[PDB]
Design an enzyme around this catalytic site. Structure first.
Site, PDB file in Angstrom:
ATOM      1  N   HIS B  41       2.531  -1.768  -8.739  1.00  0.00           N
ATOM      2  CA  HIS B  41       3.083  -0.673  -7.917  1.00  0.00           C
ATOM      3  C   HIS B  41       4.532  -0.293  -8.317  1.00  0.00           C
ATOM      4  O   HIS B  41       5.144   0.556  -7.661  1.00  0.00           O
ATOM      5  CB  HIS B  41       2.961  -0.915  -6.399  1.00  0.00           C
ATOM      6  CG  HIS B  41       3.909  -1.927  -5.829  1.00  0.00           C
ATOM      7  ND1 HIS B  41       3.447  -3.086  -5.246  1.00  0.00           N
ATOM      8  CD2 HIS B  41       5.261  -1.906  -5.736  1.00  0.00           C
ATOM      9  CE1 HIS B  41       4.524  -3.746  -4.850  1.00  0.00           C
ATOM     10  NE2 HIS B  41       5.636  -3.080  -5.131  1.00  0.00           N
ATOM     11  N   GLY B 143      12.948  -4.712  -2.285  1.00  0.00           N
ATOM     12  CA  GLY B 143      13.343  -5.208  -3.593  1.00  0.00           C
ATOM     13  C   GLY B 143      12.834  -6.608  -3.894  1.00  0.00           C
ATOM     14  O   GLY B 143      13.033  -7.108  -5.000  1.00  0.00           O
ATOM     15  N   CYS B 145       9.657  -7.523  -4.183  1.00  0.00           N
ATOM     16  CA  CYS B 145       8.389  -7.550  -4.916  1.00  0.00           C
ATOM     17  C   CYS B 145       8.560  -8.122  -6.304  1.00  0.00           C
ATOM     18  O   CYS B 145       9.558  -7.840  -6.946  1.00  0.00           O
ATOM     19  CB  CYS B 145       7.729  -6.175  -4.947  1.00  0.00           C
ATOM     20  SG  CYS B 145       7.494  -5.422  -3.310  1.00  0.00           S
TER      21      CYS B 145
HETATM   22  O1  LIG Z   1      10.226  -4.361  -1.353  1.00  0.00           O
HETATM   23  C1  LIG Z   1       9.414  -4.008  -0.506  1.00  0.00           C
HETATM   24  C2  LIG Z   1       9.229  -4.835   0.724  1.00  0.00           C
HETATM   25  C3  LIG Z   1       8.489  -5.974   0.636  1.00  0.00           C
HETATM   26  C4  LIG Z   1       8.361  -6.903   1.710  1.00  0.00           C
HETATM   27  O2  LIG Z   1       7.629  -7.898   1.674  1.00  0.00           O
HETATM   28  N1  LIG Z   1       9.059  -6.601   2.849  1.00  0.00           N
HETATM   29  C5  LIG Z   1       9.817  -5.451   3.025  1.00  0.00           C
HETATM   30  C6  LIG Z   1      10.490  -5.221   4.224  1.00  0.00           C
HETATM   31  C7  LIG Z   1      11.233  -4.063   4.382  1.00  0.00           C
HETATM   32  C8  LIG Z   1      11.295  -3.127   3.373  1.00  0.00           C
HETATM   33  C9  LIG Z   1      10.628  -3.339   2.177  1.00  0.00           C
HETATM   34  C10 LIG Z   1       9.905  -4.515   1.977  1.00  0.00           C
HETATM   35  N2  LIG Z   1       8.682  -2.893  -0.645  1.00  0.00           N
HETATM   36  C11 LIG Z   1       8.999  -1.846  -1.627  1.00  0.00           C
HETATM   37  C12 LIG Z   1       7.797  -1.588  -2.527  1.00  0.00           C
HETATM   38  N3  LIG Z   1       6.595  -1.331  -1.721  1.00  0.00           N
HETATM   39  C13 LIG Z   1       5.547  -0.587  -2.263  1.00  0.00           C
HETATM   40  C14 LIG Z   1       5.811   0.533  -3.065  1.00  0.00           C
HETATM   41  C15 LIG Z   1       4.766   1.274  -3.596  1.00  0.00           C
HETATM   42  C16 LIG Z   1       3.457   0.910  -3.341  1.00  0.00           C
HETATM   43  C17 LIG Z   1       3.175  -0.205  -2.565  1.00  0.00           C
HETATM   44  C18 LIG Z   1       1.767  -0.642  -2.360  1.00  0.00           C
HETATM   45  F1  LIG Z   1       1.666  -1.875  -1.836  1.00  0.00           F
HETATM   46  F2  LIG Z   1       1.111   0.168  -1.542  1.00  0.00           F
HETATM   47  F3  LIG Z   1       1.091  -0.656  -3.495  1.00  0.00           F
HETATM   48  C19 LIG Z   1       4.217  -0.944  -2.016  1.00  0.00           C
HETATM   49  C20 LIG Z   1       6.294  -2.411  -0.774  1.00  0.00           C
HETATM   50  C21 LIG Z   1       7.477  -2.620   0.148  1.00  0.00           C
END
Ligand SMILES: O=C(c1cc(=O)[nH]c2ccccc12)N1CCN(c2cccc(C(F)(F)F)c2)CC1
Ligand SMILES: O=C(c1cc(=O)[nH]c2ccccc12)N1CCN(c2cccc(C(F)(F)F)c2)CC1
Lengths: 304, 304
Positions: B41, B143, B145
C-alpha cells in the site's frame, strides 16, 4: 493508536555489553570508550558476602585477575579502580560501538529501559520505573548483575542504572553509573528494608490522559476537585502528593484532550474511592504508574 | 526473580530498518541482503484507498519511483515485484548488517517482539501476541507501516510480522514476510470484522506457573479438575479449549513447580468463576495470556 509498555530500541546498548570474570564470579560489564564499568561485588567470595571490606578485597586483586570478554575477544585490562560501588577496569581498546552517551542520575517516578544480560549477552529488554522507594520491580536471575538501565534521546544513550542485587522481597536495587546506589541500599548480603512504596500520581494521571486519547473514556466524570482535596485522597491511598509542577508537566496532555488537570484528578479520585468495578483502562484492571507524561506524549505523538 | 513483559534485544533488527517513499507516501521497509520488503500500500494514493487495483497501480510505477533510504544513504532500486501484500524492491547493495534470518509464519497464541518505526527509525520495542482472531493489540501511529515482529533464537532472527493497518476497533492487522495476511484482513480502507477473540488458555496457565515460581501462590487450591470439566468453564468464559498438546508443553513448568497441570486448571477454574477479589498475580489484576510456556521457561531460566 494502542498503548503498550514500550522500551527503547536496545541496539546501541547491546554493543557495549561485555562479560567480567574475577575469580569464580561472572557478571556483566559496560564497555564505553576504554573503560568497562561493573558492580564491585564481582571481587566477592561467598565467605565475605555478609560484610565485605571492598578496599582490602580489591587490594588482593591485580589487572590480570579481571577478565573482560566481548563476545569472543579478550580485552586487555591495563588499569582498575573503585568508584563507589562500581569498578572501572581500564582496557587498551576503545569500544568501536560506543554510542553518544551521558551518565545521569534519574529521579524517583522516572522511567527507563533495562537490557537484561547474562554472560555479557543481552537476553531481553523491558521498560520499568524507579519507584519512589528507589527500587525497581525488574526481572533478573543469577548472572544478571551489571545489566544496565538507560534512556535514548535521538542518538544519545543516557545510562542511569546498573543492576546490583535482589532484595529478599523480590524487588531490585542498583546504582547509578558512578556507583552511587539509588536508595539506602548497600552491596552486602544482609536484610535491607525496602521502604514504603507510593504510587507515582503524575504518571497515573498521564496514563489516564493516554486512555482518553486511545478511546477509553468510561472513567471520565462531571466532577472536579482542588489540589488540596485530591491530595487528601492520595495520602489515604498511598499515592505521591501532586504538586503544581506535576500540573505543569501535564499541561500538554491537558491541551491535547481538552480535560483540565483537576478534572482528571477528580476522575482518579473516584477510581481510588470506588475501584474499576470490574472494568479496564487501556487493557489493565489497575491504575498504572510506570508511564511518565513524556512517555505518553512520545507514544501518542511518535518520537523516533 | 521478577516477571516482566520482555521483548528480545532489538539491535539485529534496527540494522535492517529503512525508509521507503513512493510518491507522497512514506513507510518503513526491511532491508535483508539486496532486498527491501515493505507493505504494497506504499503505492496508494488517497483516492484508490477504498479498493485499490494493486497490479494496475504497480504497473504505473518504475524502479526510480521507489526511494529507499537507510539513515542518510540512498539505495539504488534495480528491481521491484509484488509478492501477495508486500513489495520486494531489489537494491544493488547487500545490507552489511543483515543477521542470520528466517521468514516464519507464527501461529495464534504465539508471542513476538515488535520494533515500531517511523521514517525508517526505530522508536521503541514491545512484546505482543498474535491473538486467536489473527490481530495484534499493538501501538502504532501514522508512519508505522512496515514495522516488523520477530523472534530471536541465539543469533538467528525469525521475522514473522510486517505491520500494515489499524482496524477501526484500535487493533492491528498485518502480514507475514511473504505478504500473506494473518486473518481474513485485506489491505483496503474498508470496514473489516476483527472477529471474536478468545483467551490463550495454555499461556494464562504458563503465566500462573511463573506466578508460583516468583512467589505468588494465593490462587493455588486443594481442588483438581478433568480436561473435559475445565474446558466447559473455558467455553463459558471465552477461553481457548485446552488440548493434551497444551498439557504436554506445560510438562516442564509442571515438573519445576510440582503442580500437576490439571491442579493448575482447577486454580484457573476458580479464578474464572470467582475473580481475583481485588488481589493481584505478578502485579496484575487480570489473567495474562501474552506469555507462552517457552517465554515463562526462558524468563525463569535465563536463556540469552
Ligand atoms: O500509518 C498508518 C497507521 C497505522 C496504524 O496502525 N495506526 C494508525 C493510527 C493513526 C493514523 C495512522 C495509522 N496508516 C497510513 C497508511 N495506511 C494505509 C494507506 C493506504 C492504504 C491502506 C490499506 F490498508 F487500505 F491498504 C492503508 C494505513 C494507516
Ligand atoms: O545474579 C544475582 C542475582 C541478582 C538478581 O537480581 N536476582 C537473582 C535471583 C536469583 C539468584 C541470583 C540473583 N546475584 C549474584 C551476585 N550477588 C552478590 C554476590 C556477592 C555480593 C553481593 C552483594 F550485594 F552483597 F554485594 C551480591 C547478588 C545476587
Amino acid at each position: 493508536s494502542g498503548f503498550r509498555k514500550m522500551a527503547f530500541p536496545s541496539g546501541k546498548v547491546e554493543g557495549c555489553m561485555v562479560q567480567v570474570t574475577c575469580g569464580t564470579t561472572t557478571l556483566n560489564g559496560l564497555w564505553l570508550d576504554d573503560v568497562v564499568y561493573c558492580p564491585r561485588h564481582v571481587i566477592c567470595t561467598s565467605e565475605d558476602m555478609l560484610n565485605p571490606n571492598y578496599e582490602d578485597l580489591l587490594i588482593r586483586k591485580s589487572n590480570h585477575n579481571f577478565l573482560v570478554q566481548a563476545g569472543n575477544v579478550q580485552l586487555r585490562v591495563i588499569g582498575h579502580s573503585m568508584q563507589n560501588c562500581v569498578l572501572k577496569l581500564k582496557v587498551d581498546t576503545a569500544n568501536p560501538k560506543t554510542p553518544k552517551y551521558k551518565f545521569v542520575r534519574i529521579q524517583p517516578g522516572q522511567t527507563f529501559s533495562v537490557l537484561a544480560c547474562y554472560n555479557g549477552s543481552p537476553s531481553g529488554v523491558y521498560q520499568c520505573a524507579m519507584r519512589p522507594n528507589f527500587t525497581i520491580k525488574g526481572s533478573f536471575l543469577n548472572g544478571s548483575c551489571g545489566s544496565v538501565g538507560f534512556n535514548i534521546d535521538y542518538d544519545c544513550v543516557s545510562f542511569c542504572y546498573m543492576h546490583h542485587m535482589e532484595l529478599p522481597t523480590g524487588v531490585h536495587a542498583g546504582t547509578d553509573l558512578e556507583g552511587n546506589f539509588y536508595g539506602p541500599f548497600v552491596d552486602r548480603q544482609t536484610a535491607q528494608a525496602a521502604g514504603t512504596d507510593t504510587t507515582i500520581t503524575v504518571n497515573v494521571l498521564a496514563w489516564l490522559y493516554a486512555a482518553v486519547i486511545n478511546g477509553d473514556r468510561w472513567f471520565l466524570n462531571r466532577f472536579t476537585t482542588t489540589l488540596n482535596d485530591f491530595n487528601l485522597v492520595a495520602m489515604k491511598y498511598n499515592y505521591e502528593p501532586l504538586t503544581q509542577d506535576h500540573v505543569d508537566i501535564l499541561g500538554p496532555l491537558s491541551a491535547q484532550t481538552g480535560i483540565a488537570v483537576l478534572d482528571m484528578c477528580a476522575s482518579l479520585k473516584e477510581l481510588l474511592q470506588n475501584g474499576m468495578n470490574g472494568r479496564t483502562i487501556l487493557g489493565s484492571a489497575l491504575l498504572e504508574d510506570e508511564f511518565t507524561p513524556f512517555d505518553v506524549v512520545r507514544q501518542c505523538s511518535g518520537v523516533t
